Enzyme design. Sequence first.
Site, short mmCIF file in Angstrom:
data_model
loop_
_atom_site.label_atom_id
_atom_site.label_comp_id
_atom_site.label_asym_id
_atom_site.label_seq_id
_atom_site.Cartn_x
_atom_site.Cartn_y
_atom_site.Cartn_z
N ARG A 113 -5.56 10.81 22.54
CA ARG A 113 -4.76 9.89 23.33
C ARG A 113 -3.35 9.68 22.80
O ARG A 113 -2.48 9.27 23.56
CB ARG A 113 -5.46 8.52 23.43
CG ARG A 113 -6.41 8.38 24.61
CD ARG A 113 -5.67 8.28 25.94
NE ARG A 113 -4.85 7.08 26.04
CZ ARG A 113 -3.54 7.02 25.78
NH1 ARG A 113 -2.88 8.10 25.40
NH2 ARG A 113 -2.90 5.87 25.91
N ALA B 164 -8.70 11.71 13.23
CA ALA B 164 -8.02 10.43 13.29
C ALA B 164 -8.34 9.70 14.59
O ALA B 164 -8.50 10.34 15.63
CB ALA B 164 -6.51 10.61 13.17
N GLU C 213 -17.98 -5.15 18.87
CA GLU C 213 -16.60 -4.90 18.47
C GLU C 213 -15.73 -4.91 19.72
O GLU C 213 -15.72 -3.94 20.49
CB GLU C 213 -16.49 -3.58 17.72
CG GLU C 213 -17.08 -3.61 16.32
CD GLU C 213 -17.67 -2.28 15.89
OE1 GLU C 213 -17.46 -1.28 16.61
OE2 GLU C 213 -18.33 -2.24 14.84
N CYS D 50 -7.95 -2.33 12.62
CA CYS D 50 -9.17 -2.09 11.86
C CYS D 50 -9.77 -3.39 11.35
O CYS D 50 -10.97 -3.64 11.52
CB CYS D 50 -8.89 -1.14 10.70
SG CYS D 50 -8.61 0.58 11.19
#
EC number: 1.2.1.27
Lengths: 499, 499, 499, 499
Positions: free
Chosen positions: B179, B149, B383, B283
Amino acid sequence: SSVPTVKLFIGGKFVESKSDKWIDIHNPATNEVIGRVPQATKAEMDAAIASCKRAFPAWADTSVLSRQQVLLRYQQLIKENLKEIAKLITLEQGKTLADAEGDVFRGLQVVEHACSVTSLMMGETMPSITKDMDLYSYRLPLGVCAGIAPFNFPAMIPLWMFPMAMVCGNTFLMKPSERVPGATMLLAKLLQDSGAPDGTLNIIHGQHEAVNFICDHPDIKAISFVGYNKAGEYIFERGSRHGKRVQANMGAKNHGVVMPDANKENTLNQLVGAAFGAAGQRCMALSTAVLVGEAKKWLPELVEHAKNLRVNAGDQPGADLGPLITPQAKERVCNLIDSGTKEGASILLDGRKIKVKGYENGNFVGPTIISNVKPNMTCYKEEIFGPVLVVLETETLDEAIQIVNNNPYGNGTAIFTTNGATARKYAHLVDVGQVGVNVPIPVPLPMFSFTGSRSSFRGDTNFYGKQGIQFYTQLKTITSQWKEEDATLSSPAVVMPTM
Amino acid sequence: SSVPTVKLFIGGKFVESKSDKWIDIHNPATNEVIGRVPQATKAEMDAAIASCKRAFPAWADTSVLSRQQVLLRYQQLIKENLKEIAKLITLEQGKTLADAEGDVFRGLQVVEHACSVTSLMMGETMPSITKDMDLYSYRLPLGVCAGIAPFNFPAMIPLWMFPMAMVCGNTFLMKPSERVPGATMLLAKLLQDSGAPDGTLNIIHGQHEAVNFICDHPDIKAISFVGYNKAGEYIFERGSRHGKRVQANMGAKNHGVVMPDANKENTLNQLVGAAFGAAGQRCMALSTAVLVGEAKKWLPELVEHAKNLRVNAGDQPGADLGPLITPQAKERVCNLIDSGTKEGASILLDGRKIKVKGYENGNFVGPTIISNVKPNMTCYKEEIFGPVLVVLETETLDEAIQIVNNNPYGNGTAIFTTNGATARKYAHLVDVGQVGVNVPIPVPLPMFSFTGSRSSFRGDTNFYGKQGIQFYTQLKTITSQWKEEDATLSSPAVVMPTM
Amino acid sequence: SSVPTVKLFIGGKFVESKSDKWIDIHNPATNEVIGRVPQATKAEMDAAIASCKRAFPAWADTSVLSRQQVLLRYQQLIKENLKEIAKLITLEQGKTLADAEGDVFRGLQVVEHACSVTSLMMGETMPSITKDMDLYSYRLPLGVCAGIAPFNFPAMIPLWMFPMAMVCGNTFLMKPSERVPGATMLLAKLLQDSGAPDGTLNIIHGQHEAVNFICDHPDIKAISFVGYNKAGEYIFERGSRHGKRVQANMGAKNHGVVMPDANKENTLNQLVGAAFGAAGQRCMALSTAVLVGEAKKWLPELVEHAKNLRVNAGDQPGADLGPLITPQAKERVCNLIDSGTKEGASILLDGRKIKVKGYENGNFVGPTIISNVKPNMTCYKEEIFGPVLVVLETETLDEAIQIVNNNPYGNGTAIFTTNGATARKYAHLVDVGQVGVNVPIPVPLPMFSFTGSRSSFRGDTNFYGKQGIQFYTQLKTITSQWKEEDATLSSPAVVMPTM
Amino acid sequence: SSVPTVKLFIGGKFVESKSDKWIDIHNPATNEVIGRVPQATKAEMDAAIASCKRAFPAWADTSVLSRQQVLLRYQQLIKENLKEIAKLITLEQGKTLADAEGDVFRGLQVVEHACSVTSLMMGETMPSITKDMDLYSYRLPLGVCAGIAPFNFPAMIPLWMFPMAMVCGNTFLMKPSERVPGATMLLAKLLQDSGAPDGTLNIIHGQHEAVNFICDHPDIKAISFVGYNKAGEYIFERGSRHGKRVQANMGAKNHGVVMPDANKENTLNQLVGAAFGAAGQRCMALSTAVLVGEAKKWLPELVEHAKNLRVNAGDQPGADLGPLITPQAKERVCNLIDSGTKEGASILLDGRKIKVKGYENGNFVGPTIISNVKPNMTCYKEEIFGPVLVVLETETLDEAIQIVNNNPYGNGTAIFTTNGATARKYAHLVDVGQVGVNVPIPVPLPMFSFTGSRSSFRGDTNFYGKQGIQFYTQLKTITSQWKEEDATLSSPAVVMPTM
């Protein structure tokens, strides 16, 4: 006499080529030149795709029913002309008339499964998912598609790719095989006679330059290949770079595990008719036999059952298997048997020196059963594609499950037994989804998908069912929010929704 | 004093790791060490794989009616503990209290879809392929699954992989991020306290020493990853070279085209909520705004709207956007913002130097708007993943459509207008999967699938939806040819079964 | 008096009848005798039903594939024989040649849709009911169907009724309209030449006695009717007296609401084409204008667009509309125009008193735009079925929605605008089953059905489509009561089964 | 002497009525008072519909996926609370402990099949058939529905009404029977604890004054009922007059046709277990019976088969019969059978004085098989609703089709033959869809539909199954024509195709 050559299908009728290189089509039974295949230059292959670009809009804007009625009539036109196609198949491939007709019969169940697309390529929609929010899904044609055909099937594979691509609104750029293209031209004639527009199917010929040109034009959206590993990975890699979808069906090698509880005669006959039938030049054969436990005592009876097989041309009656496609395949299948006998593998029956009467200069190869082979020789770790049957001698069913799971290439497998508790176990403990109990060749009937797991099937989607729509069409989801303020023309929108 | 260390979930209990290397988990709002995640050793991962193997048989033999009830209780325990799951994401990632709750809601919404399937289970039979011959299909699990993930969603993406995999008989080895692991140790306890056997879900930590294990171990047969391209491609290659299924979702750079006839207030409120929401760490975020026609006069009002958003920690009521995940992202965003002025852009609003009263030591980046940006600088082909909005200005719709179709990082699009003929043409002339009309965040619903794009996704099946169910299962057809032929035992069958 | 007579179709031959009630057919363009249709005697109807019941068994046990092939051949013949059907239509009814061509195209569409019945003749299949007790369901031919045709369409209703009826394996009685029976003769001729067995389709002529016989004979199970509501409910109650399912879709007066932001030219042309098309004698006719807001000022232009229509006969080049079928319709239209003038409504364009060069004898009524109409006069509540466009005026879309909702008859509507939300919150606020945006006629494709209302649909199901199969058939539910307790020649069913 | 008075379900919580008029319940075992029907008046009866309308938008906006989770959890809640409801049914309805268990098990199967409606509640969004055109359909809930249940099955019938309606987005106001208001209350209690917002389901109690209000209420859009020959038609008329879509399954006296070629060790047992088992008035039980051939010989044999089973209270094990609903109904059945005994219908086995030991106040009845039955008899044609087997003495085979067609209640039959051809020819020309060849009771699947052919039904559409969404939802089709010359605002639209 002038050798009748084949003509391309660029435009709306058969047109003659303009190149100079010719490929000679030899009769598999007599090795006699019966046709010439052109090698049209890059200009003709480009004009073909160009003609595909001026027929895509008219074909895509048509309704699904208007597209599927053409195939409904195509199926009947072929059903009333099965003998003509079977004769060409037998004359240019060597398959028996029975198998030649069965091939065209199998190529019609896909056209029958391509007429029910009206219930699939429609879309989904659900309103009132949010305040004044409505969703719509659509499926749009991809564009121009491509397809290559192997030497094995000259009528089955052709009627597997372009039917669905056309019923989905796309145009097909087909490349027949370089050894038997007549069936494709006859099927294109029948398609034109079935009421299909012009410029839909574009036939191009070649040996290795057409395959390159296919994965060269950025205006190709989908490619379909049935061929064997060698050109499968090449086409996949060369098409994935240009930005096109690719689906492939590589040659497999199914494994047959026999049990003592099974019926001796029926299983032996199925094994001897599935591994040596159609000269073993099929996409799913049974050349790998595994006699487990006591089942390895019927080997002399299997050899005797393979002896009575009538090796003769497909035109003569009473024949079971025919010759090979090319003389080089005979040299290859003979070198394989030589490598087998070198390492000690005992050959019960041999057919390397079989000369059938009436057809001397031919590629006739008889049944060659090999036993006492280890899983380390070229006889077991290489596609045979011929009348060869390798027999394994294990002890228990697990010793067979552990070998039928490590084979590199495989579409399915067969287990000959009568006990259900062990058949279900063998089915649930294998990595191949096409497991057949007392079934020689588990075939992916067009009503269900195909289960090529790792190395016998490149690509992601399939040709028919709910996977061919997801391969020749593109999904488009639209989430539209139309505020309620516009119910009357006296109030604008000064708010926003939530999530 | 001490920092709460993260522990592993191996065997069914939260065991402490014995490793010596640790990674500090800080508070992105204060940059203070709040936890320490250990790098799982080889023995711990081997034990996790062994525990996933030990519980795979009992979990696969269980019926779907008993597997879906565990998740039906899990989704209720989540809805009851939403206020606790939403309080750790804000402390470890920085999302506002209004965004963590929405993420948990979207996660439990997909958990609600992983239970109610009842149709894509073992399979459905369709007899009558041949005389008393069936084609029964069976849907079986794969084995031990894996999942990695990202930092974007520590409660939504985790609720996309294991809920859909564990329902289909499979197990899972979920590898959370490095994190924000605090939101994954609470989603597993509520699953063990929901009637789930011990061994159906394992959790191992690590940055890259665990990804190599997941990709190399030949026991895992399914991997799911969400993140950036540099790691997605590496994971895809390392997991496809070994022979296991791998799906990898990548970030998206959406594009929003605004028309002059659109709703000014609504459009400006929806654009500033999809470009500066969640600190731009999403996203599918509208990071580009293409003003077409005379809509270029709304830029001052857009800047004024982006200047009213409150920038503060998620715990502080009233904040709309939080800080970044890591200090290395603030510098990366500031570099791309300065690249605009370096390449000849116009930064209308500068959010590089912000001072939040009380949290001046965090990775707080304010709303940034850069106009006069061409499709050649480093701000359009990268990005950003931050509160940066690039505003392009055109005069026709054919140019905006081209700009939208000329980017590889774009999977979704947005059109803002009040006309029925403009949005239709926009959605018909663009090449994307998820189209949205007047929708800021066109995220697919759980019932639907996360349709990827060319570069924003590598694979065929999505994470959730109908394709997500097919991704975590295998199909197997069983041709029987064993029927009531001996039901009347009078003589054995010696005839060939033919169609 | 050399005009020919219309023959019957008893048994399969064009036999004549022996009676004296020969009703004459008058040309709508010149009011001249062009043929005589006889009133079939009771003996003729008896012979027709006898032939139908004799052919029913031979037609029910026939393969559906042969039925589909016969329907395909009939479709091809209708495609070839096109000018003849259009000439018959424009000579019997008087509509323009283009309108007759469109009608024949809709007929071909419904025929090709009926051909696609390969996936509709079967029923639902859900296995695993209880212990070894399965059930295989299908659909059987209901029996001897019937059908009455209106005057509005002489080729649409036959091709909607009898092909879908006989494609499932049923014989069909066809009662053609007593004003336009010319097309059905050629239709039945082409159908018989298509390979259909002689005796499946029968045609009985008459005015009121034939409908009574169809509603009285017990062997006629199902019937179908289209036309006014009077005869509709009449035959509905007559069938209910005997227990017959009869679909009686009559017709609907759709309402068109135009917004000020709509394309003036396109909307004003579509309104003229839908209100003065086919001489207003259409089923889903848009004989109403609900212009909202600033659209009132579009009244004069509309009148001009109505004055630009060339009122001529059917075969005159450039004719847009045609004459009425009977003088009764003409005098009714004139009486309604007089009543509208007396009620206070202002008629802008007067088509009541008009003369056509060389056709001053036929029933010719030109366009008539009756403006200033309120929902309390006689023009708003009546079955005009002619070139009449009642123009209602409002100022808000809510008033138009209310005026459309408080309408006794009518299931279709139309909205005209260039917005995205004005055409989205209007289909929901209204109470109808067919809404059209920028489309005057909201009729869907043959795939769907024709939604109706209290005075526009009676019976079981609406009309043809996927429901036409359920209508003209019965559900056959056959269980499987063979268990395993007698599989291997074991004890009989002596054990008590429980749930 | 204060029996527990059952409450009223309005607003979510159980309230007690206040009207001066009350009605009590009686335990059919020994006529013991259990509760009091809370018959209400216009006070709360009108507010129940308002409360349903309050939660109707909230339930409609809720997605189908979230609406079906309530039913998925209710399925498990029923599976758990099986004996709890069975006990109430046994002490209120008066049936054996196994009949109530089966009634709840099949009602649970109903709500199980009702959860699989997520895919069907979408509609259809067809792609662009013509340039700049599309067609999208929606299924929208009507409003607050209602339904009434008879004193036949207090568990089965209700479990078809609310599960199918609420899952479509509507609200339900159920009026259960007055004899057993103990099972529906607990079922609603278990449903509200499944995740249903209080208000999505209400329950009222009373008498004919309640159903009259349900019918005359102007805020109801659907009625589902099950009753006798009188109540069904009365409700259908009162609904059709008030503009209410009604579906009412009326009384059904079915057939038990028997043939000689059948092993009678179980057929005779089913004859007495179908129509007599715990007041076997089922809509598919074998009430009548036509003895043909050797079946006529089994006149005394079925008497012995009936004497095998014993009559006893339901709560006690080993009981097949059960106490009737009321003593008035017992006297009514006794008078109905006396009317048969006095006209010629001989009574071979008397069951009019079956006073089970210990139960002198209960309404206990036993086998009352009537012999020598004639078609023209009164009790043979009227509805008996009691344990009576009227065996017909005939010898025909082809006329048996006529003897079953003359019976107006064609809702149940039986074919006790071994040859499949006889059953095929019987089901070919039979009026009932559910054939009973070798079945105890032909109960269709939850996915199918169970309606009455012509007599025991008043309506057009079906009841349940996949037809479930045909009666509680409206079909809204929208055909939108969004041109392409309006996307760019620099192109005025003045062209429109006229066809």
